[PDB]
Structures are given as C-alpha cells and as structure tokens.
Design a protein around this ligand. Structure first.
Ligand code: HEM
Ligand SMILES: Oc1cccc(-c2cccc(O)c2)c1
Length: 137
C-alpha cells in the first residue's frame, strides 16, 4: 500500500526522483518555463547536471515526508502551507502540482512493480485540495 510505497521510493530515492521528474518534464514540456536551466538537454545530460540531481532529490525527500505524515492520503495542513509559502514556489499554481502527480501515477502504473497507484492518485488530488485551501491559486 501507500506506506510501503514510501519505503520503496525512499530505498532508491534519487533514482526514482529523477525518473519521475523526467517523466513529468517529458509529458509536459511547457512545464520547463519553471526550469529554464533544463532546456535543450536530453535525460542523460540532465542526470549529469549537479542541481538537477541535488534539487530533484530534495524535492522528493520532502514529498516523502509529506506523504508519510498524511492520514488516509490527506496531507497535514501545516505541510500544505509550507509548500504554498516557500519562496521557490512563488510562481506556482495548483495545476503545476496536478501535473506532477499525473506523471508520478503514470510512472507507477508503467513500472513493473506493485505500487498502490490509486493511493498516489488520491494523495495528489488531496494535496492539490490542501494547497488551494492554504492559498495557492
Ligand atoms: C509535493 C511536491 C513538491 C515538493 C515536496 C517540493 C519541494 C521543493 C523543495 C524542497 C525545493 C528546494 C530544492 C532545493 O533548493 O534544492 C523546491 C524548489 C522548487 N520547486 Fe518545488 N516541490 C514540489 C512541487 C513542485 C512543483 C509541482 C513545481 C513546479 C512544477 C515546483 C517548482 C519548484 C521550483 C521552481 C523550485 C526552485 C528551482 C529549483 O529548485 O530548481 N515544485 N521544491
Ligand atoms: O528539481 C526540481 C525542483 C523543483 C521541482 C521539481 C519537480 C517538479 C515537478 C515534478 C517533479 O517530479 C519534480 C524538481
């Protein structure tokens, strides 16, 4: 289920983080407006860029903690408010997060593995809900 999937992802987190973020960027190329350093690079080139690996892993480090602190796939209000208020998220709207989670769920579905894709789909919807309640446009 969802708790075990957090463990699974944490057990190889930089790999999963990069692969899921690449799935996102490749599915939604316009999303690179927010990541201008990542333009004009293949996946292998991005995995060679120090900030790509560093930053993407730190995104998923926090994402896994938000998932772990959730109840029934519903994040804490404090976690949602942190994600809204972060200066690095100034530009963002809930649609950006929706898209991240669509890509993450598709990645899990296409993996060979027994991820609880349903629970991640709910988590994404519930996080988007919580971001809106905490004041994200
Ligand atoms: C639950 C989902 C997310 C979490 C937990 C999260 C967390 C983080 C964290 C921890 C950082 C700092 C990274 C660092 O400085 O090393 C960061 C930066 C950033 N995040 Fe988020 N983030 C999430 C979703 C998103 C989404 C959906 C977008 C846009 C589509 C986004 C855009 C940014 C940008 C532009 C930065 C700074 C630029 C960069 O780090 O390259 N984040 N985020
Ligand atoms: O390196 C970064 C820094 C900020 C955010 C992300 C990100 C954004 C959308 C999907 C996703 O999986 C990861 C990646």
């Amino acid at each position: 289920g969802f708790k075990q999937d957090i463990a699974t992802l944490r057990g190889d987190l930089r790999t999963y983080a990069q692969d899921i973020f690449l799935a996102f960027l490749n599915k939604y190329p316009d999303e690179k407006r927010n990541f201008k350093n990542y333009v004009g690079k293949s996946d292998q080139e991005l995995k060679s860029m120090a900030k790509f690996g560093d930053h993407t892993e730190k995104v998923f480090n926090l994402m896994m903690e938000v998932a772990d602190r959730a109840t029934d796939c519903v994040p804490l209000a404090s976690d949602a408010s942190t994600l809204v208020q972060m200066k690095q998220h100034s530009g963002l709207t809930t649609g950006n997060f929706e898209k991240l989670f669509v890509a993450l769920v598709e990645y899990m579905r296409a993996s060979g593995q027994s991820f609880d894709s349903q629970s991640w789909d709910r988590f994404g919807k519930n996080l988007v809900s919580a971001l809106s309640s905490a004041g994200m446009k």
